[PDB]
Amino acid sequence: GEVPIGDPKELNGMEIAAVYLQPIEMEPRGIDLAASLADIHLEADIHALKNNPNGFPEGFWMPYLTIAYELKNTDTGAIKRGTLMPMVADDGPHYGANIAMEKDKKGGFGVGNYELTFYISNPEKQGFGRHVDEETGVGKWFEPFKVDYKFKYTGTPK
Amino acid sequence: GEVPIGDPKELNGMEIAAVYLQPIEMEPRGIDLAASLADIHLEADIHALKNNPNGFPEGFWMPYLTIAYELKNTDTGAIKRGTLMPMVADDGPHYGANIAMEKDKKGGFGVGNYELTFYISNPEKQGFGRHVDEETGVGKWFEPFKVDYKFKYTGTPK
Ligand SMILES: [Zn+2]
Ligand SMILES: [Zn+2]
């Protein structure tokens, strides 16, 4: 199951949605938390809107983004942070991370009320280039920004 | 104002076409050869085919590839190698490099018959993941490969 986290935002020429899923078995091994040690996969779905000012066609996945996350259980105060990594599934690329929830004994990450924040930086931080000549050039990149979501976490999708 | 280089190749779930155009100005600075030192901008246009085996939607740009090129003037025997870098223009993302031809201080890269080779490695080299679970997983990435083109360079179009 895919559970939507809050409502998707249209910001800075992109549609930015958050969902969580069952833990994802991913390769290459070692880069991310193993699926068996996780309770969910947190995903950011980020695609260009129409009239994207940085030259991305409508619907294209936005690549080379840096996406940090903060996940807060507002009931318990438990907080965890990390970064999502780029990967591909049978239905296309996304940003994601396996996350231990109930499995994490270092904090109160069980069923409850959560706040999720993404801190998103533009592709130039990873060295992705942009044409700036008059003939082929595009608009300047957005400055780093945050999007916030509130959701109820009800357990690993079933 | 793109000049086609040879015939496009379809392999490993991708269409791989090459074009050149006038030199472009890229940010961030100090990575790509400066436009004034160049004669052309070489581009690799790489998009998913139908039924891409790694889950990329048809038409999507293929991101996180490592791509080198070798360019050989078959008339003079002059050969140069470099890297293509990911970037976005007003027509979307591509891999490209500004290249000195007539302006190459070594000489031998003027108007003539050329062989161009791309050497391409998969996204895992750059930390890109893939789902491997039964429900949403995708197959292995291609091993490093090359594709070859033949074309006539008719001079700097700047
Ligand atoms: Zn994933
Ligand atoms: Zn370019």
Side-chain angles (χ1 to χ4, degrees), chain A residues 21 24 26 41-43 85 87-89 94-98, chain B residues 130-131:
Chain A
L21 330 64
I24 294 302
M26 198 201 72
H41 189 80
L42 177 57
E43 167 166 343
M85 61 164 285
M87 71 188 72
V88 70
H94 72 273
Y95 297 95
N98 287 334
Chain B
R130 72 186 169 99
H131 291 213

Side-chain angles (χ1 to χ4, degrees), chain A residues 27 90 94 130-132, chain B residues 25 27 94 130-132 136:
Chain A
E27 281 193 7
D90 68 349
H94 72 273
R130 68 162 188 120
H131 289 214
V132 305
Chain B
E25 295 168 42
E27 290 186 7
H94 69 270
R130 72 186 169 99
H131 291 213
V132 299
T136 69

Side-chain angles (χ1 to χ4, degrees), chain B residues 6-69:
Chain B
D7 301 314
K9 287 101 176 73
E10 300 179 359
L11 66 183
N12 301 328
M14 309 178 272
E15 169 190 84
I16 307 171
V19 303
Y20 74 87
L21 62 153
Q22 71 285 354
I24 61 85
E25 295 168 42
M26 199 191 76
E27 290 186 7
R29 292 295 181 200
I31 300 300
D32 193 34
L33 183 65
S36 75
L37 299 178
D39 291 291
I40 64 174
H41 190 74
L42 176 62
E43 295 187 347
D45 282 326
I46 310 185
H47 301 84
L49 304 171
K50 294 172 173 64
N51 281 303
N52 170 281
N54 306 109
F56 275 87
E58 185 186 11
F60 267 29
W61 183 60
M62 302 295 297
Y64 297 93
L65 296 173
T66 306
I67 307 176
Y69 74 86

Side-chain angles (χ1 to χ4, degrees), chain B:
Chain B
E2 308 173 1
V3 176
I5 291 167
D7 301 314
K9 287 101 176 73
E10 300 179 359
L11 66 183
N12 301 328
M14 309 178 272
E15 169 190 84
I16 307 171
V19 303
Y20 74 87
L21 62 153
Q22 71 285 354
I24 61 85
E25 295 168 42
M26 199 191 76
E27 290 186 7
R29 292 295 181 200
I31 300 300
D32 193 34
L33 183 65
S36 75
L37 299 178
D39 291 291
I40 64 174
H41 190 74
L42 176 62
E43 295 187 347
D45 282 326
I46 310 185
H47 301 84
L49 304 171
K50 294 172 173 64
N51 281 303
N52 170 281
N54 306 109
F56 275 87
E58 185 186 11
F60 267 29
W61 183 60
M62 302 295 297
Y64 297 93
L65 296 173
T66 306
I67 307 176
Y69 74 86
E70 175 175 2
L71 187 59
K72 171 195 294 71
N73 181 315
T74 57
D75 312 314
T76 62
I79 296 169
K80 59 159 75 190
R81 298 171 195 88
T83 65
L84 305 177
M85 291 293 288
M87 64 190 83
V88 67
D90 58 4
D91 63 345
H94 69 270
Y95 296 96
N98 278 350
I99 299 187
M101 298 290 290
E102 296 95 323
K103 296 198 67 146
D104 194 302
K105 65 180 178 167
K106 276 174 140 270
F109 298 102
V111 170
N113 298 298
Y114 281 77
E115 292 178 349
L116 169 69
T117 306
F118 295 147
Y119 299 91
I120 301 174
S121 293
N122 74 49
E124 298 194 7
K125 200 162 179 282
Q126 292 187 20
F128 189 89
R130 72 186 169 99
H131 291 213
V132 299
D133 53 300
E134 186 159 322
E135 193 183 358
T136 69
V138 301
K140 282 192 180 177
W141 283 111
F142 62 85
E143 293 284 291
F145 70 97
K146 66 176 211 298
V147 287
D148 299 311
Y149 306 84
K150 286 186 188 48
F151 76 107
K152 185 135 212 314
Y153 174 57
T154 53
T156 179
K158 71 182 170 273

